[PDB]
Curated annotation (Swiss-Prot), chain A:
Its biological purpose: RNA polymerase that catalyzes the synthesis of short RNA molecules used as primers for DNA polymerase during DNA replication.
Protein name: DNA primase
Organism lineage: Bacteria, Bacillati, Bacillota, Bacilli, Bacillales
Organism annotation: Geobacillus stearothermophilus
Stated family: Belongs to the DnaG primase family.
Domain note: Contains an N-terminal zinc-binding domain, a central core domain that contains the primase activity, and a C-terminal DnaB-binding domain.
Quaternary structure annotation from Swiss-Prot or TrEMBL: Monomer. Interacts with replicative helicase DnaB, as DnaB(6):DnaG(3). A stable complex DnaI(6):DnaB(6):DnaG(3) fragment can be isolated; DnaI and DnaG do not contact each other (DnaI in this complex is derived from B.subtilis).
Curated annotation (Swiss-Prot), chains B, D:
Species whose genome carries this gene: Geobacillus stearothermophilus (Bacillus stearothermophilus)
GO cellular component terms listed in the entry, alphabetical order: cytosol; primosome complex
Outcome reported for the amino acid change (mutating residue 351 to A): Partial loss of helicase and ATPase activities, ATPase and helicase partially activated by DnaG primase, wild-type ss- and dsDNA binding
Entry GO MF terms: ATP binding; ATP hydrolysis activity; DNA binding; DNA helicase activity; identical protein binding
GO biological process terms, semicolon-separated: DNA replication, synthesis of primer
Residue segments, region N-terminal domain (NTD): 1-142
Lineage: Bacteria, Bacillati, Bacillota, Bacilli, Bacillales
Protein name: Replicative DNA helicase DnaB
Length: 141, 420, 374, 420, 374
């Protein structure tokens, strides 16, 4: 099965920052992380530290100070199909998928509010909730 | 089975209405509730239409209310279901296309239904026959007259557009907002050729489309501080410089072709070269380039020296993405994308079919070579009245500005177009 | 069970054996393919193959014919032929039985056509417009026809021939042309053929104008080459004698301005419905024309031209549209029909169902694209 | 196996002889006893021939006697068997056709026999070869020269027929037993066109077959009290009335075609109409009718008003029973049946092949379009000597009466045929 | 495992669903056949078929398109289309991913071509020379190309256009022809076309002589019509102005003898390498020419003529030979090319890559088969 965009966006971003400290610094200010997936936040931390010590673009030396449990992931990403020169729009696109992922998750709170209304036959409430959710969805895509 | 249907398209139509209430107008024009194959969708479309006829806003709430009052909410899947429809539409603006797909599949179901009905009657009533054949004629025709056609544009409305055109042609003042052409009368109408515009200059062979494009490219580069990129696919770089040297310094072309050069015709040549050397003219005389090559070269140029115009010596010579009807459309579409990317006017010469002679060129003459008509925001035809060394430049299409005929004079001896 | 009449079939073949003359009336009404059973099909064919030689048709000559082409056994042998010959008490009613066989045959064809169309509805999805057109055509092609049974008495033709020399329809705006037609009659399909630059489009537009601005009749024009914009430009250019070159190249003199405001006030009162959609189908013409009549009125229908809409189908379908809307339809052509008219220019007419066949003559001003009287 | 045979046809041949003793003459001409595949049939045919050679009557009794004396009765199935043969013949008059079938199947058996024999000799004698090829040539030819051919008609016998024709052409007096044509010289020969006759008038285009038929139809309807039914498949009813109005009142045709009409040429027209209105002329201008339609319409007419002639403007336009070589034969055959049914002369115009020019029309010119030759009891050709406004009417066939050329004059201006 | 990039493919289709504009750059770089997976092939085709109508490309219009042509299920259904649309985080790098797909496609084609040639080596044995030629051709046809990325500045063309009016190569022996070429430049493919008796062969020989006896350059002539014997006979006949009829018909006058001993002493110093083998292949030309340069020197290559060696391949292969040996190649023709020259006789030139396009004029003596200046 194919991975969701936000996840691909995190992986690709990681794949790039592992080979470019120029990109690693941009992601540090723009994204915490703030990465959505734990393992990705974990790698992020280890990638950030790599420059905040001195070390430059070298995926060889990185996969050796990483706590072994993450190694398999860093290994996988360092082989992912990437042209090592990210475009201006690409970062905006990737970062945007990561930054408003939590926002898509906010929807599911209202999705339950809606279905519960629906269960107790409070339909106009349920519709109103759905009407709000469409606005929130437009706000993101 | 299974009956022609498009649940996906049905879902996108109803979804569209929930995202933009304006989507219901185009949808109701093309469809009635019974066109929907799925009962829930019929009930839903019907609820929308009812709400709309009351002059009440059509959205998730009022459709929910409507269906609850007609006891149809649960039956169509509830509010939750109206939500899903809203998530099933790739783009609300594409609602007509989704609608047409639904309609198409409805028409097919009616074809199948009436055809079957005729077949059945053939076995049963047997009986009459003459009536049978007539009603079989009748019933089949009825299937076609169902699709949303029309409407006729009324003459009053066109007269308005016609008069408003005549307004623009005289209201013509006077600033050149785009790239000046050097032909003041063409600049009045265009203003002149503008950034991001795809300009198509079509003309039958011997009319002088190549000379026209070169004159423009020459005027831009020598007069303004802008760079022009010329792609000559039928003519070499030197063969083309020969023609703009003549045009520049007023040197008889045939005279150069035969070595003959009067002492001062030679001094005429050195001034042409001197003035032409300062111009930003970049020529690629690659025999049959693909659009990607054109695009890549222009790309590098704009960020290396800056770019102002792109001229391509006839489009039917550009080879496609592979190794012609559909192929030309993609090239057309690609040239427009080229214009938008580099924020530059792209002048693509086009050849006309042998229809002009079968009648003054019009849109249908490139329509058999389309769909360049759609992509071009400006389509120009060159027509010579005497095939008076005067030539007509018919601007058949212009997205922002008037439509009419600008007139210039052609001088064979120098291969030039001059004002009037 | 496919419509059939084995009994009718059996009587026909039997009648032929009983009296060889019966083959003539049967051969008039039937072809071998009309018989539902192959055996009968084979037999009737053998029967015809002998008559064509032309030898007498009887049990021996037919048996010998079937045997020679290795199909005596398949049709049941001499037993069956004799059964058919011995069953028949008369051959006086051959055509009664022949006509029954023919009917069942037609019904089978009806069924086969309709089933095919039904099946195509699932398989080609993909080709909706092509499907609807060929289904129209396919059904039409099931039924012939026939020609009821009415001889025309000479008395009746004479009146129509006399009155056919010395304006009951829609006025064209050309008196000399109104003489030959008087004028454009309802349900007529009018074909106007021509060569490059004469010009067909100018002629079509002129009639569309002269009908719409002088009569309260609505014309529906379908132009497939030039846009509605270009079409109206030519019309007011001719309407008010305005030089086209001046409308096109902005600059208008004040003779032109006053001459223009005149032409479009005059043209606003019509009466003109245009459709400039590139490749249109005949049925799309019908939909728009039916919805127009039922909402506004009409009519006259002008089409420019017909080889942009195999021409036989289009032509026939145009005649049906004319007869359906009880309105004249003029279709141009480049070089079944009610009136045929080819093109100081000469209008030659080659065909007219009721009117006089002759030649008219009109003038043409190049600068206004207008045709005028002499 | 099985060897080509037709027991059915063999049975019908012998049967025929038992029903009509005259049937033996045609049978013996075409067959010898050995052509019969079945031994009993050989023995029987041989008995018949023997009886016949004695000048004794050949019937069931003498054949029975003959076979009893040669001890062959039981062997061939007895008297009972001779009975069965008598019941096995559909029609004694068709004996030649049955005979030919038997002969055909005999010839095939000889082909098979000699071919096999050659093949066998190929494996055996091997040996000589040159002799083998020659006798193989020889033996194969011998199979063909076996069928009953001939005979040549002798010149003496034709001279008699020729002279007897010349007798009829001068012995021509004088009563008109059929429908008068109005062309007294054509009436001498025909007398004139008679009830039940199928009359075919063939002519190349531009010769005037249509004008000829109309003149006849016009003369019959205006002069005699009879009704004429005209089927015009290439020409409309008004276009055809135009031509008979001109012919009637002497009005220049081209004059009418151009509106021009001298004051008294108009008075000429009113008298034509007056006289032509009283005539019983019924026209059907249906583009391509089938024969059944023609037949049905004529049928109703004769019993509704009475009918005297049927004229069909060219036969090659009549469409067949389906939706051309075999098809035309059936139409021909059907038109003759039409003539017999309504007891009326049927005049069917025919077009000639482009053979006349490859040489005065003859039978072979419609023979490539046959078999109209057989069905027609009268075939007429129209030939103009100068392609003197005189035209020839060659009567090539007439079942009851002479064969020759009748001559008439054609007037282009009025599209008429006049006497001489 | 055939070279492929499912991931690249998936990003391309995904990008199109995310932003319909992405189809334009992809359609520029790719055709459906480039996708390794049929599903993707089918999808990309559907995508293009909708754009051509020209309707918006999105999940619904594409789904409807695949379903209409009965292939929605085969490509994985709406699930797969949605998977592709949901996976894509950006469409900014479509052409990056497009170019990866294109490369893998090229490599597959390379592999397919080479395997085929390898397989043909066993199966056709039988046809060695035909095999080697078509293998050359087949490999050449794998690679396009491209056109690096160099616009020519006008300044640079101007110098070449000026200097292109007012002898840097190999001298032809005709001053007026050396003006238009100055003279025969290295790596140029020169085509000289003509009609019966002018004559092409005489012209070819003359240049071959005038180069070889006046310059220390070696010419390689390939004559496919006349033998080396006949070719040398014509050369010394023109070289020393000797009447051909006298050489042929034995009897020579003493003007001819002295005139002959002069012509062949003069011709012995060249400089001339002939090959008169009837039907020669372009590669056989290369083998002999490469072995000649590497052992002696050269050059100029004269071929008489090219339709005795589908002409497109030969022509292209001749250009490669010229560019390989850094030597001018003149190929005659009977009525890609560097110089095209048609034929008191007039030499019309239609094409020249760097030189002036014009017309030269030379005389021709019938009795010596020689061309001379004016």
């Amino acid at each position: 099965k194919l991975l969701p965009a936000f996840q691909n966006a995190e992986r690709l971003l990681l794949a790039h920052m592992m080979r470019s400290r120029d990109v690693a610094l941009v992601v540090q200010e723009r994204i915490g992380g703030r990465f959505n997936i734990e393992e990705h936040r974990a790698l992020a931390a280890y990638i950030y530290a790599f420059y905040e010590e001195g070390h430059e673009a070298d995926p060889g030396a990185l996969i050796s100070r990483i706590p072994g449990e993450l190694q398999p992931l860093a290994s996988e990403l360092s082989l992912l199909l990437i042209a090592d020169d990210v475009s201006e729009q690409e970062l905006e696109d990737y970062i945007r998928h990561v930054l408003n992922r939590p926002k898509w998750l906010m929807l599911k709170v209202k999705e339950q509010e809606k279905t519960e209304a629906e269960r107790r036959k409070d339909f106009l409430t349920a519709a109103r909730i759905a009407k709000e959710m469409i606005e929130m969805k437009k706000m993101l895509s | 089975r299974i009956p022609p249907q498009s649940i996906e398209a049905e879902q996108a139509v109803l979804g569209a209405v929930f995202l933009d209430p304006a989507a219901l107008v185009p949808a109701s024009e093309i469809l009635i509730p019974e066109d929907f194959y799925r009962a829930a969708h019929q009930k839903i479309f019907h609820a929308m239409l009812r709400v709309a006829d009351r002059g009440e806003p059509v959205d998730l709430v009022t459709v929910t209310a409507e269906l609850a009052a007609s006891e149809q909410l649960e039956e169509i899947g509830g509010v939750s279901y109206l939500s899903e429809l809203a998530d099933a539409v790739p783009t609300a603006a594409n609602v007509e296309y989704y609608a047409r797909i639904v309609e198409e599949k409805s028409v097919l179901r009616r074809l199948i239904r009436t055809a079957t009905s005729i077949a059945q009657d053939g076995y049963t009533r047997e009986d009459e026959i003459d009536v049978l054949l007539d009603e079989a004629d009748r019933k089949i025709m009825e299937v076609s007259q169902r699709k949303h056609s029309g409407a006729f544009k009324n003459i009053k409305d066109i007269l308005v557009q016609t008069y408003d055109n005549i307004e623009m042609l005289h209201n013509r003042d006077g600033e050149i907002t785009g790239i000046p052409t050097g032909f003041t009368e063409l600049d009045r109408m265009t203003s002149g050729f503008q950034r991001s515009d795809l300009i198509i200059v079509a003309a039958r062979p011997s009319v002088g489309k190549t000379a026209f494009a070169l004159n423009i490219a020459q005027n831009v580069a020598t007069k303004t501080n802008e760079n022009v990129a010329i792609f000559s696919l039928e003519m070499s770089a030197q063969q083309l410089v020969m023609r703009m040297l003549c045009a520049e310094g007023n040197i008889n072309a045939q005279n150069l072709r035969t070595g003959k050069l009067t002492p001062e015709d030679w001094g005429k040549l050195t001034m042409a070269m001197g003035s032409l050397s300062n111009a930003g003219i970049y020529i690629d005389d690659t025999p049959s380039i693909r659009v990607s090559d054109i695009r890549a070269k222009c790309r590098r140029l704009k960020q290396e020296s800056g770019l102002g115009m792109i001229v391509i010596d006839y489009l039917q010579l550009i080879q496609g993405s592979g190794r012609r009807q559909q192929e030309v459309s993609e090239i057309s579409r690609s040239l427009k994308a080229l214009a938008r990317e580099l924020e530059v006017p792209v002048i693509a010469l086009s050849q006309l079919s042998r229809s002009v002679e079968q009648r003054r060129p019009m849109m249908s003459d490139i329509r058999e070579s389309g769909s360049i008509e759609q992509d071009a925001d400006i389509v120009a035809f060159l027509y010579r009245d005497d095939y008076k060394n005067i030539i007509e430049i018919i601007i058949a299409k212009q997205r922002n500005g008037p439509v009419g005929t600008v007139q210039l004079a052609f001088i064979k001896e120098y291969n030039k177009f001059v004002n009037l």
